[PDB]
Design a protein around this nucleic acid. Sequence first.
DNA 1: TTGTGCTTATCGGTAGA
RNA 2: CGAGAGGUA
DNA 3: TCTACCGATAAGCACAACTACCTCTCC
Lengths: 198, 34, 366, 96, 62, 285, 94, 113
Amino acid sequence: TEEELKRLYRIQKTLMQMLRDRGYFIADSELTMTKQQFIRKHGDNMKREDLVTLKAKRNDNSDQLYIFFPDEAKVGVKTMKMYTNRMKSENVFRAILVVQQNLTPFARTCISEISSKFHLEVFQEAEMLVNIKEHVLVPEHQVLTTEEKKTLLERYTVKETQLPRIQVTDPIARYFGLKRGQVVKIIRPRYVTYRYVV
Amino acid sequence: NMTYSARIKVNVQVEVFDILIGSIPVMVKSILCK
Amino acid sequence: FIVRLSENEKAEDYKRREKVLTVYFLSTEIPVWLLFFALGVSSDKEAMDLIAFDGDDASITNSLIASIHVADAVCEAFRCGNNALTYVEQQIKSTKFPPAESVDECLHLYLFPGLQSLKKKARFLGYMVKCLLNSYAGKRKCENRDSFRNKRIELAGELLEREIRVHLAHARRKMTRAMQKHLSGKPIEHYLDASVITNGLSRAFSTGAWSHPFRKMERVSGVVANLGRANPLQTLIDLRRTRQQVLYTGKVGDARYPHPSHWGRVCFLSTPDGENCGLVKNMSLLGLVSTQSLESVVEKLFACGMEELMDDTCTPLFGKHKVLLNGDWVGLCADSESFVAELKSRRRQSELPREMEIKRDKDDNE
Amino acid sequence: SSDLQSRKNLTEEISYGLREAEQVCNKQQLMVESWRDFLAVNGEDKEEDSVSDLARFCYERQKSATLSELAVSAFKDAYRDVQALAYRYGDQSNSF
Amino acid sequence: HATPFSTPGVTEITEQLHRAGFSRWGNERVYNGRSGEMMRSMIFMGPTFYQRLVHMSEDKVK
Amino acid sequence: QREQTMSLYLSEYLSKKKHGFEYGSLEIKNHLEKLSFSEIVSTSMIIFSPVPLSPWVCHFHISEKVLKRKQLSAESVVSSLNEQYKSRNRELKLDIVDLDIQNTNHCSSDDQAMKDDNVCITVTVVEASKHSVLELDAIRLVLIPFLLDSPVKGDQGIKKVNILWTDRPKAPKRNGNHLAGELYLKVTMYGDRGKRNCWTALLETCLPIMDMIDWGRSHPDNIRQCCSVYGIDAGRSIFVANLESAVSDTGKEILREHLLLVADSLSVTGEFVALNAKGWSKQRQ
Amino acid sequence: PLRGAKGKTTTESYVPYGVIENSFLTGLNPLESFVHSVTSRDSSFSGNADLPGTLSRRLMFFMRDIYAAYDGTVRNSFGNQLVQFTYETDGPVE
Amino acid sequence: STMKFCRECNNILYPKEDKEQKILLYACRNCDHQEVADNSCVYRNEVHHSVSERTQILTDVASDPTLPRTKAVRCSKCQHREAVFFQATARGEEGMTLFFVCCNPNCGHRWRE
DNA sequence: TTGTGCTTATCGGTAGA
RNA sequence: CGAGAGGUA
DNA sequence: TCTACCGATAAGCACAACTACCTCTCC
Ligand SMILES: */O=C1\[N]C([N])=NC2=C1N=[C]N2[C]1O[C]([C]OP([O])(=O)OP([O])(=O)OP([O])([O])=O)[C]([O])[C]1[O]
Ligand SMILES: [Zn+2]
Ligand SMILES: [Zn+2]
Ligand SMILES: [Zn+2]
């Protein structure tokens, strides 16, 4: 079953790279590690449980995101309820669910009904095999802050609506964890452009 | 500005126990043409 | 008469869904083996001998076995007795507008009227099934609409004939309606209308709309055109044209490019540039159109040495080729080469009609 | 051409060039997966059969699309040299 | 004769035109009508059959 | 789209070995190309052999030349057939429990002996002491058409793979643009009408061979799904490249600004809308 | 191959491919003229001309509302939507 | 795919299996006649993939793919970089060997790896 | 004669309480 | 006032 | 134990198939 082991290794490496790109203080030990080290530090069987860690932001120690790996596929509402209870108890506001199959409509309703309280992200194992950011076609993406957004809107004297739009379902927005109302700075290989997440 | 046609006649006998049907246009230099 | 090779949908389960042979006769959708055994056949071996496939293929054998099984399951004890005739009579009588004739009468004047014998039409059906199977196997090429070998033209003997027939039918309907309204409650010169046909012909010639060969409504245009007096060449080339009726002339398809059958018949170098390119074809200088022959060539063909077709279905053919006259099986010939040579010699001596085509092909052996 | 002899030489050269282009097209048509055993450097006794069947190549080409495109490309490549003969057999004062 | 599929050869046409006292290629030396000088290159001249079409200039004025 | 053209580029570490690129491309083509079992078997027949508990057994005779050409063996194809049977197992709605396949170079078949170098593959059905499978029509119409369509090499998703040479690829190299030639592969896959994308399925098939395929340049040839896989910017770049290629093939010279303006105008809302009225209405909405 | 099938296993469609050794000066055989006419029948302006017009109309309906403003940005007529922040303008003296 | 006719009934026979006899027999549904079978063969078909009849000419099915072309290897007899490469077994060697055939119309040279 | 959408609608088809 | 067929770029 | 929405696939129906002109010939 070494194919599953290397698949999980690639998934973990891609997740760590995404977290480092998003600024969650990922150590170089977890980034420069090899497959031999990964399987030596794992043991006999991981059962998709050792990968569940908790990462906090570099600038702010209060903000933290926990990656949860489900024990089995075709997850239902009981696992979602358990995850929500765990997040409420541990007082965390972000979580990443690396699922195997597609979610159920009831799971979608549950995750959309409590989206205002906490924000959740769902990623498939087929999508996290190749790093999207590490590609020759994808240019550099820079997320702007509130002050930068205000200065950009004041310099051109243009409303946030009158800007090029990028959907939330786009792979880059989910890679950077972008929410609605945030603008990004794109540098093309010079002239730059800005996209509004709607 | 009229039609160059020829009349058609056939005898009809009604039994209980040559009439005119129509005119067909005639092509020039046909079997019936001056 | 249509024989179609498609999968079985009537009384078919999930496991048994494969191509079978069906017969579309008088909108009845009857199996082919029931029709075979109804036409004086009482053995499967004789039916297989009639359909002389003469090839090794698994799909054809599977289709034949499926057809036999479907025929067996449709009617019980269809081989013994006249059960097939009763079944086909019931199928015919179940139509929306069944004919007033019985089963025996509908099998004579409706099914292959050219063959008087009840057993010869079974052989013709077997030949048709053999041809269909050979075409399906790929040994025989299918007919194409671009070649002039499969196309016939009609200038005035049939183009105005259908208009005359429909106008006469309308006049007869009006006359009988007037008679029914007038008799109950007179010379024959008043019942028959003398202006309806003339007005219809005038409208057809003026508006240009002509009756469709296969549809009562949806009159086609472009049949009757005008002439030009700019120069005599224009009126000479306007009187010599051929039109191909294609739906949505915007996408003609294959019938736009010259065909090898256009050799010496129509001009492959002069076509009207535009939307109707390829549809209108100018006839060549040495172009003639054959008319209907008045004399019968059956006696002359039998005098050359052609023998009559066998009435019994038990006697097969060894090397005797098939003789087809206007698509009708008229007899058999031992050697095709000498028969064709003698027929051509008789034709060249003013003993046969000059507008006759003699075709001898070694592929179909006919 | 300058005279009749030059015209005859040009006609013969054009005929030979067309024959060479056809031969090149037939050779290029063999670049398929069915002739991998023949294209290999080994001992094959069917070398004469590949050149004896000349009329079958046309039928095989006209029944396929990729083969037809490859044949067209090869024929154009071999016919560029044939077209390049007008500068040799043409005069400077030629209007065309 | 000028039958389409039975056209005479170019050599026959050249010989026929040469026997008439003109150049074999159909070109003749011409002189400019404005200045009188002789042109360097011969001009091909021949009585071709032309036609007049029904389209007129005054029928298109709108 | 049903064709769903893809594009995969080779890695740069194969240049160290002599003729490394050609061998890598050939190995990839041999790995991820579909080869049906019907193209390998020459004669298929059913023989009444009679605890086996199988009234009818299926014989599939395969010549050794085809196996040598395709670099396959009898054990390999038997294992592939077993894996295909045990993977989906959704068809063949019969009273069949399992299915065991045997291999024998010589079989006791006296019907024909035209080929002496052709091995025989015997497929034996398993019945739980019943007569629901004793019929021949069901076996012939279900079991025979099923395993003949089961692939022995590659997966069912990939239709055809061809090796092409290019000089101006859509995805350039990182920084070593000195070379002016590549030997990338073009992959055509059947159109997945479901929610699963063809790119994700291709990523799963290429798990045994990951380092050889350069995933930093491989991109789908389609424009719409590229925006969903890699992002709107990658789709815009591919669209600009395709527009430039079309303009160059048309024989005309068009400035870059016009093409860039068209590309930016057709992707204002983060999605390449169509030129019909529906796309304009959606963009305005 | 011209006679329907090249000796039968039968054929259904063909892609014509022929080479004419003669030229237009020496004359053309009737079969050569037939081949040339078949090849040249595909050339027609009005046979395929609706596609360029439809494409031009649908592209104009998308691109006619794009203009550049006094601020240097490329705006849109509907709601002053921003399309490009800066025109490319390789030669910016304009 | 193998059909036979009874010598007494002259009708199609249907294969069947007998539990007590443990042999293959053919019987027709019209007459009670069960004859003995030969070779114990009930189906035989040559595997052919010609399911698309009268359609392989118009549509390019690509039954015979073309060999790939490369521009990296350089020929010896001529200085032409374009050549076709493929894998095929040798006369007696075991394994796959990469070959190269020059694409120059005037060269016609082939060589191994 | 096809090329895209667009709406039924029509069967399953999974969870799911 | 429309409708049907041909032609010009 | 018995649905409630969700999904894949016919199906029947729509709109659309380039511009600017000039002619005849029924209404
Ligand atoms: O359907 C058409 N649509 C459209 N926009 N223009 C058009 C259409 N059909 C014809 N045209 C116009 O005609 C000319 C064709 O050029 P032509 O035939 O008058 O001259 P040449 O030089 O091409 O050919 P010859 O006579 O040999 O000298 C097009 O320009 C087009 O505008
Ligand atoms: Zn065997
Ligand atoms: Zn019997
Ligand atoms: Zn060389």
